[model samples]
Target: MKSGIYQIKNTLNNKVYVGSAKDFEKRWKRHFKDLEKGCHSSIKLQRSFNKHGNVFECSILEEIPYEKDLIIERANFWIKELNSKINGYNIADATFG
Candidate 1:
């Protein structure tokens, strides 16, 4: 129930998924295992993405303080600042844009 970052592992490949979480593990279970109330699955994206490419790796890239309210802004700033780095997860539209 705290804020942090979560890295979701793709069941099929070596690629990774990045996300911010208030409760990282719970959120993950909601997405992958329990399929939470609103979230179901990424079956479409998984199938589509898994076909031509592979993304089978995931890890917690970073964890920020729960007190921060400007998280999105911070994420954007980091993404823009670190876009060239390998683990830079905010440059894509899925996150901040």
Candidate 2:
């Protein structure tokens, strides 16, 4: 139930992918599994994973108290703040459902 904005950082080049999840731990696990299986959604991230082979580090950027709208808002903030969409692995802007 740890809802928040989380980041996956590629330590080699300091590129990042920013996102938010209602369950941060589960999300991180899924990401790692997908990357390991060579089927991650983000092509850029998967490519980096293939080349770097586990140089990515996952960490919480900010912890929000499971507010649905606020989670996306803060995710977007961190995405832009870190320039992930433009300079890193994020392909699009985060949106609220």
Candidate 3:
């Protein structure tokens, strides 16, 4: 399986913005291009990206599952947990922001 990068939105807010690609260069370029068009998964984040320069920092918390079904489960788990951790998500769990 191929590896890719993932970034957590501003810890101040609870929006999950993630990407996956077989190659980093192509994926990175796509992110840059979309940023210009203002149509990323979250439009608001796309515009807000301007506040960041050059590169965006991401915390590689885990390697993720290799199995197809497991991958989906992990992605959703990470997004939900990240949301709760970053912005005080509504879900009642120990991983609250």
lDDT of 1 by residue, 1-97 (tens): 6556555554554334455666666665555443323233444434434453334344555677644555566544544444422443222523421
Report the error of model 3 at residue 14, Å.
Answer: 10
Instruction: Tell me the lDDT of model 1 at 35.
Output: 32
Ranking according to TM-score, highest score first: 2, 3, 1
Off by over 4 Å in 2: none
Clashing pairs in 2: none
Clash count of each predicted structure: 7, 0, 0
All candidates in order of lDDT, best leading: 2, 3, 1
lDDT of 2 by residue, 29-88 (tens): 999999999998789999988988889899999988767678777888999999998799
- Given candidate 2, what's the lDDT at residue 33? 94
Residue 87 C-alpha lDDT in model 2 = 90
C-alpha lDDT of candidate 3 relative to the true structure: 0.48
Q: Residue 46 of model 1: what lDDT?
A: 45
lDDT of each: 0.48, 0.88, 0.48
Q: After superposition, how far is residue 72 of candidate 1 from its true place, in Å?
A: 1.7
Scored against the true structure, residue 19 in model 2 reaches a CA lDDT of: 86
Better of 1 and 2 by lDDT: 2
